[PDB]
Each structure stands twice: as structure tokens, then as C-alpha cells.
Design a protein around this ligand. Structure first.
Ligand SMILES: *[C@@H]1O[C@H](CO)[C@@H](O[C@@H]2O[C@H](CO)[C@@H](O[C@@H]3O[C@H](CO[C@H]4O[C@H](CO[C@H]5O[C@H](CO)[C@@H](O)[C@H](O)[C@@H]5O)[C@@H](O)[C@H](O)[C@@H]4O)[C@@H](O)[C@H](O[C@H]4O[C@H](CO)[C@@H](O)[C@H](O)[C@@H]4O)[C@@H]3O)[C@H](O)[C@H]2NC(C)=O)[C@H](O)[C@H]1NC(C)=O
Ligand SMILES: *[C@@H]1O[C@H](CO)[C@@H](O[C@@H]2O[C@H](CO)[C@@H](O)[C@H](O)[C@H]2NC(C)=O)[C@H](O)[C@H]1NC(C)=O
Ligand SMILES: *[C@@H]1O[C@H](CO)[C@@H](O[C@@H]2O[C@H](CO)[C@@H](O)[C@H](O)[C@H]2NC(C)=O)[C@H](O)[C@H]1NC(C)=O
Lengths: 259, 52
């Protein structure tokens, strides 16, 4: 026997993802605005078919490892790693796309900044960040791959570009590729998404001569002993149960189950 | 004395090409450059070729 409802576990409410998957929560999908508020939880709930993730098409590098790392996370503290108005004075940060609607309009992710030319020139880009928050910091970025050479020339003024991300445990260089691709969600270009964890006392360095979707917000994670991810369809209500399944909650002391 | 270089290691089970990358890195043990290390296991009767 089970209740048939998701509910509390040791006095802490779960984090209901709703219509968002993990990509839409960590990237800042425009339909997932309510999930970006400093908070804490006991476990994570997923709708089985959630269709609000990467609205711009591309490949999320190491999705399932990010899921395994975010399984044992108690709380996050969302902070602004790079201020948008201050840190980019020589580029235009106002970049929107029609592949991500918001309120019958066009908008972008809430944790990333699309950088484009300003006054006909794209200067060299080099930024650094030092972790001092005494905990791990999750950093996300992306690399743009356009459809033709005219798009690349109109948005970045160079045929060849590169992105370099260096930390004390991360060291990787990216080059854009231009080809003809099938249309997904009305766009033929791609944006490939990447992530890393900064340790305390470590420094991350970004360099770019083009094709960078720069970070805007970052997460400060805290670990915990008991948590997990549950895929479920039962509605959320109130209890104080010590046991939780996808099909409901359990309140007894018998040694076995078949739920 | 070259802006561009390459290393090639070829065997009957190994075939890899390496291109050096130049960037600004945080200092570990007082040095900013890096050296990346690699290994292989030659079988009996096999030949390994280094080009650089
Ligand atoms: C088989 O495949 C290969 C590879 O896919 C094909 O090779 C490609 O061919 C095309 C066409 O021949 C080449 O494009 C040309 O590049 C020339 C060099 O560019 C220089 O000048 C640029 C100036 O930038 C300004 O103009 C561009 C438009 O060209 C604007 O987008 C931009 O915003 C600026 O306003 C520099 O940016 C650049 O760095 C170089 O210094 C161009 O001279 C040439 O322009 C002609 O065509 C334009 C229309 O596209 C026209 O508006 C111009 O007036 C001019 O007539 C053109 O863009 C590719 O460079 C080449 N690829 C590579 C890797 O070399 C190959 O053609 C294909 N085979 C067949 C048979 O199709
Ligand atoms: C969030 O998800 C909804 C549906 O899960 C998306 O709405 C769909 O958008 C596509 C366009 O790509 C339409 O073809 C469908 O008809 C829409 N379905 C519904 C039910 O409206 C919505 O676009 C997603 N939003 C983002 C930002 O990804
Ligand atoms: C979420 O928490 C962060 C701290 O982790 C808050 O950021 C701080 O905000 C206060 C007030 O503006 C500043 O004085 C601190 O300097 C900020 N700290 C950092 C490291 O950015 C953030 O405001 C919180 N957001 C909420 C309340 O949702």
C-alpha cells in the first residue's frame, strides 16, 4: 500500500522540476524562471516527458555525469560570475534568438550571454575568475557553430576563431565548424554546451577570438548525505514520510515491499 | 624555430597525431607551460615510429 502522492521527507520539500529537465534548469531556460532562486531540498522530481531543455539545438557534453553529480547535492547558491553590463564593454551583449520563445517574443537563456560584434570589430577576449566561496562552483558555457561563412563573417568578422578554457584540472581548446545541417526547431546552426566544477582556491581562464556564449550566472553547490532523483507523475502534497517511491509514500515497519 | 609543429606516433595498434597549443595558463609549481605524457605497449615483433 502507498499514498499515491509525492510529499515531504524529514521536513524538507522536494524540488519539482515541472516541465523542465536538468539542462533547462542549469542553463536557464526562459520557461524555467521559477527554479532560479536560492533554495534547498531533499530530493528532485522529474516529469517523465519534459520538453523544455536545450531550446537551441546542440550537444550537451557529459549530460549523465552532470546528473550523477547533481544527485548528491543539497543546496545551491546562484551568484553572478560575470556582470553583463560591466565585463563586456567592447561587445554587444544583446543577443536574442527565435528558437527560444518567451511571452510571444524572442529571448535567450538566463545564465548565458551571446556576444556579437560592436562597431564592426570583434576584439580579443580574455577573462579570469578566482573561486573564494569555500565550496565548488559549477560553470557553464557554449561554443557556436554557424551554418555558412556569411553568418560567421557578419557576426564575428573572422573566418577562423577559437575558444580556450583553462583551469587547474580543465584544459581544452575549441574550434568552430561550418557545414550544412538539417533543421531542428527552425534553425540550422548549433550551439554546443559545456560545464565544469571549480574547486576552492582555483582559477578559471576564458580566452576567445570568436564564437563564445559567455557565462553570466554560476552555482555554488553544497553536498549532503541523502538525496536522489525520482521520475514520477504523482501530485505533490503534505506528509512527513521517511520513505519515498515514484508511485507514492510508505509508512510501516515491515521488512519487505513489492511496490 | 617554427610557429607550427606536430608529433606523430605510429604502431600497428597505435596511430596518433599531436598538435601543440599555446595559451595563458594558471601557474602550477612555478611554470605556466605544460607537458602531456603518453604511453603504449609494444607487442613482440612490432615496430614503433616517431615523427616530429
Ligand atoms: C567547394 O567548397 C569550398 C569550401 O566549402 C569552396 O571554397 C569557398 O568558396 C567561396 C566562394 O568562392 C569563398 O568565399 C569567398 O571568400 C573571398 C575571400 O574573403 C576575403 O574578404 C572578406 C571580406 O569580407 C566582406 O565580404 C563578405 C562576403 O564575402 C561579407 O560576408 C563580410 O561581412 C564582409 O563584408 C574577408 O572577410 C575574408 O576574411 C577574406 O579576407 C571573398 O572575396 C569572396 O567574396 C565574393 O563573394 C561574395 C558573396 O559571397 C560577394 O559579396 C563579394 O563581393 C565577392 O564577389 C567570397 O566570399 C570561400 O572563402 C571558400 N572557402 C575557403 C575555405 O576558402 C569552393 O568555392 C567550393 N567549390 C565550388 C565550385 O563551389
Ligand atoms: C517548452 O515546451 C513546450 C511544449 O513542451 C514548447 O511548445 C512547443 O513549441 C514547438 C516549437 O518548437 C511547437 O511546434 C509546439 O506546438 C509547442 N507545443 C505546445 C504544447 O505549445 C515550447 O516551445 C518550449 N519552450 C522552450 C523555450 O523551449
Ligand atoms: C543568492 O545568494 C547569493 C550569495 O551566495 C546572493 O548574492 C549576494 O547578495 C548580497 C546582496 O545583494 C550581496 O551583498 C553579496 O555580495 C552577494 N554575494 C555574492 C557572492 O554574490 C544572492 O543575492 C542571493 N539571491 C537571492 C536572494 O535569490
Amino acid at each position: 500500500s502507498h499514498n499515491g502522492k509525492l510529499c515531504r521527507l524529514k521536513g524538507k520539500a522536494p524540488l519539482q522540476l515541472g516541465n523542465c529537465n536538468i539542462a533547462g534548469w542549469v542553463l536557464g531556460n526562459p520557461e524555467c524562471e521559477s527554479l532560479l532562486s536560492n533554495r534547498s531540498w531533499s530530493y528532485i522530481a522529474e516529469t517523465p516527458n519534459s520538453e523544455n531543455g536545450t531550446c537551441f539545438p546542440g550537444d550537451f557534453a557529459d549530460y549523465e555525469e552532470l546528473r550523477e553529480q547533481l544527485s548528491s547535492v543539497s543546496s545551491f547558491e546562484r551568484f553572478e560570475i560575470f556582470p553583463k553590463e560591466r565585463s563586456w564593454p567592447n561587445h554587444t551583449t544583446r543577443g536574442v534568438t527565435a528558437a527560444c520563445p518567451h511571452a510571444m517574443k524572442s529571448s535567450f537563456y538566463k545564465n548565458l550571454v551571446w556576444l556579437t560584434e560592436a562597431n564592426g570589430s570583434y576584439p580579443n577576449l580574455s577573462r579570469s575568475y578566482v573561486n573564494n566561496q569555500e565550496k565548488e562552483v559549477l560553470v557553464l558555457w557554449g561554443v557556436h557553430h554557424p551554418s555558412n561563412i556569411e553568418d560567421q563573417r557578419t557576426l564575428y568578422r573572422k573566418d577562423n576563431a577559437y575558444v580556450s578554457v583553462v583551469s587547474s584540472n580543465y584544459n581544452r581548446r575549441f574550434t568552430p565548424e561550418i557545414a550544412k545541417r538539417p533543421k531542428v526547431r527552425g534553425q540550422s546552426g548549433r550551439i554546443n554546451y559545456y560545464w565544469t566544477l571549480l574547486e576552492p582556491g582555483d582559477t578559471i581562464i576564458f580566452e576567445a577570438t570568436g564564437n563564445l556564449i559567455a557565462p553570466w550566472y554560476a552555482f555554488a553547490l553544497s553536498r549532503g548525505p541523502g538525496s536522489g532523483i525520482i521520475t514520477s507523475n504523482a501530485p505533490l502534497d503534505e506528509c512527513d514520510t521517511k520513505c519515498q517511491t515514484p508511485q507514492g509514500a510508505i509508512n510501516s515497519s515491515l521488512p519487505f515491499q513489492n511496490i
